[PDB]
RNA sequence: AGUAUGGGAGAGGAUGGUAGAAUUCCAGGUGUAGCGGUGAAAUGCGUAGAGAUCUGGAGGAAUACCGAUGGCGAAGGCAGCCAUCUGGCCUAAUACUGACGCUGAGGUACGAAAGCAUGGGGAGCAAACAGGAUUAGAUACCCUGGUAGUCCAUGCCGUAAACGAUGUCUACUAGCCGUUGGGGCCUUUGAGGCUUUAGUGGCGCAGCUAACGCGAUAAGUAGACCGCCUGGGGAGUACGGUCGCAAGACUAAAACUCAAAUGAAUUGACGGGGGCCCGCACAAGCGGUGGAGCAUGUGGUUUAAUUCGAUGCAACGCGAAGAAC
RNA sequence: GAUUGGAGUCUGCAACUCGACUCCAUGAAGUCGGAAUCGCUAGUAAUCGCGGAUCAGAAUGCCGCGGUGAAUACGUUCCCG
RNA sequence: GGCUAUGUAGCUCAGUUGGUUAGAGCACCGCACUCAUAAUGCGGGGGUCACAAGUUCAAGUCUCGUCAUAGCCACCA
């Protein structure tokens with residue numbers, strides 16, 4: 001119902017899953033899709049293809065809200081960031097900027113123990 | 118990063134300028150380092166090995 | 181072959197039309213060394229299409245094979261020119277068998293005639309291939 | 317050996333304040349089916365609305381980049397920034413005292429982490445513990461949680477592969493290349509080049525060593541003083557004693573038993589160590605087997621006997637190129 | 642073209658257990674085969690027939706012979722040695 | 723007595739008001755993978771969907787009754 005022209009794309013990429021959230025500016029969410037939603041259960045969540053599918057779904061859903069140019073922010077390591085941002089452009093959006101915003105501590109809290117596998 | 122994109126820049130080329138920006142920044146290296154806690158003994162050993170390797174590289178490139 | 185690169189085999193043109201495309205199509209049709217039966221089938225099909233429409237068999241066969249020829253295969257990948265002709269002949273062979281004419285030569289002539297105007301089962305197979313291809 | 321005066325570098329120590337990033341929790345806005353986790357899963361969280369995203373609060377702990385084979389400290393150790401109190405070191409030239417030195421049994425001070433006592437604090441992490449996995453079993457490694465503890469104040473404990481496995485002090489013995497803090501000299505406008513000194517590194521002549529290796533930061537050549545060793549186990553154990561709230565620490569045997577236990581280096585073998593290449597090994601193709609009926613061999617079962625061998629690849633149309641007698 | 646009923650030939654002292662072949666009758670499963678797995682780089686694979694050793698008789702096995710006669714190899718990631 | 727809710731393989735949960743044209747997970751047995759094993763992958767077997775009738779072109783799936791069970795309530799010969 002509400003019409004916005006400019007938007008923000010948030011990509012939450014990890015070694016386990018990829019979450020794509022489309023917001024307007026000021027951070028109010030409009031649409032979201034994840035690799036878990038489009039099948040790809042379990043270990044299949046982390047492949048770049050699943051991230052691409054989720055990004056395509058989220059972009060198509062946001063197109064109903066009807067915005068044409070968006071700014072993407074990538075937060076996190078792992079596969080699917082590049083595939084997801086490519087899929088957003090391939091849907092027909094104009095990307096205005098692309099930057100990394102993963103949080104980095106200035107030596108804050110202690111991380112968990114190292115895995116002995 | 119803040120990779121702003123020109124009128125004639127394609128989407129793929131913009132993303133490519135992006136991974137170069139982020140690879141130059143090296144944030145993913147910090148993310149890799151942060152995920153598990155490393156003991157001070159292991160950190161000291163790693164830095165000692167790095168210093169030895171750097172000096173060997175300097176000697177090799179000088180002669 | 182790891183190190184060695186092997187040259188592609190060169191086959192002789194067919195004795196009748198001196199066409200390596202016809203020779204290779206005959207080789208695809210032939211089973212267990214019955215080149216005589218393969219020749220009978222292929223030459224009967226060409227004679228049938230020639231009497232149906234007064235057009236040079238070589239030109240008709242090459243035009244139809246170009247029409248059926250795929251630029252991509254089937255999960256999309258890319259193919260080389262040789263694979264294009266190989267897959268075109270491969271798909272053209274089966275539909276004639278599933279047709280219902282009394283002889284294989286008549287069946288294959290009918291299949292070629294139907295694929296030339298686009299209402300062929302091989303054409304449908306190519307359509308499946310490319311409507312699969314746009315998936316990626 | 318020490319004192320006065322000028323100058324310099326430093327995560328040296330103690331007290332207080334303060335800044336930014338991030339994690340967790342709380343409230344709210346958008347919004348809707350998943351999130352999280354693994355080799356794969358599951359336990360767990362979520363339609364009384366999670367995860368994601370934005371704004372605002374609470375609290376604790378630690379200080380990204382700089383960062384360095386760098387620096388400081390007797391050792392243990394010390395890293396955001398600012399102020400206060402405070403120790404040592406380096407460097408120049410004069411002046412001053414005139415052997416005032418070195419080492420050090422007993423003694424005494426400090427002394428990582430864990431642990432203990434009293435009172436606080438508690439974000440994250442995490443012994444014990446609970447559950448889910450894996451496994452023949454799993455008490456573990458993996459996963460989801462989680463208490464002591466890790467933090468502060470005041471005390472105790474006195475041990476570490478507390479290591480350079482190398483006690484402190486002094487003098488002498490080729491050279492070459494780095495780096496940190498200073499002094500001097502020379503070019504000539506500003507940045508370079510020579511030296512000298514105190515640290516910190518890489519090679520290396522002589523010498524030394526069983527060898528590996530050390531080699532002006534000696535494991536070389538000599539001197540002063542202290543500590544320690546005398547085959548492997550029993551054993552840093554027992555009894556006695558000192559200290560400690562306790563855990564325990566320190567001092568420290570014998571009976572008995574074996575003919576070895578060790579260090580360095582050499583050849584081979586092995587590795588669920590690495591690198592390199594080839595092969596119808598995989599890819600690309602064509603045709604088969606596993607399904608049916610029958611032939612033949614084997615296992616098993618049965619039998620009076622179903623004669624004996626061959627058993628992963630490398631046994632199974634194999635010895636047998638031919639059992640009605 | 643399995644199985645079964647009936648009738649025969651030959652080898653052999655002797656075809657019940659337990660031979661091969663011929664004729665009449667009968668006419669089973671089977672309509673292309675799951676997970677998986679095998680061979681083959683050219684006169685090869687595939688397909689068609691012919692011969693021999695053993696041997697009185699008893700090959701779909703073994704060892705040979707010729708006829709017709711293909712498809713595909715971009716490459717070394719992956720699997721095996 | 724009144725109101726409700728259930729009864730599906732060797733063991734369990736679906737399938738729930740029409741054309742249900744009963745499946746899913748563990749038990750097995752056989753096969754495959756392995757140097758040997760698992761897990762896993764494949765195949766086969768293992769119920770006849772509480773019973774009895776009614777409508778209907780469609781009934782485990784709906785309507786009537788008869789069982790077994792569970793929950794709450796009511797019972798002054």
Ligand SMILES: NCCC[C@H](N)CC(=O)NCCC[C@H](N)CC(=O)NCCC[C@H](N)CC(=O)N[C@@H]1[C@H](O)[C@@H](OC(N)=O)[C@@H](CO)O[C@H]1NC1=N[C@@H]2C(=O)NC[C@@H](O)[C@H]2N1
Nearest residue numbers: 161162165166167169170479480481482516528529530533
């Ligand atoms: N005046 C007061 C000054 C005080 C200050 N301390 C200065 C000083 O006095 N120094 C004296 C030098 C003695 C040195 N500590 C002995 C030594 O160096 N090795 C011990 C002898 C073992 C053996 N015979 C040789 C050996 O195995 N070597 C290895 C080897 O080359 C290489 O290992 C591998 N896998 O290839 C390398 C990479 O790690 O490690 C070396 N090993 C090590 N390198 C380290 C190092 O130098 N130190 C600390 C420790 O970590 C050392 N171990």
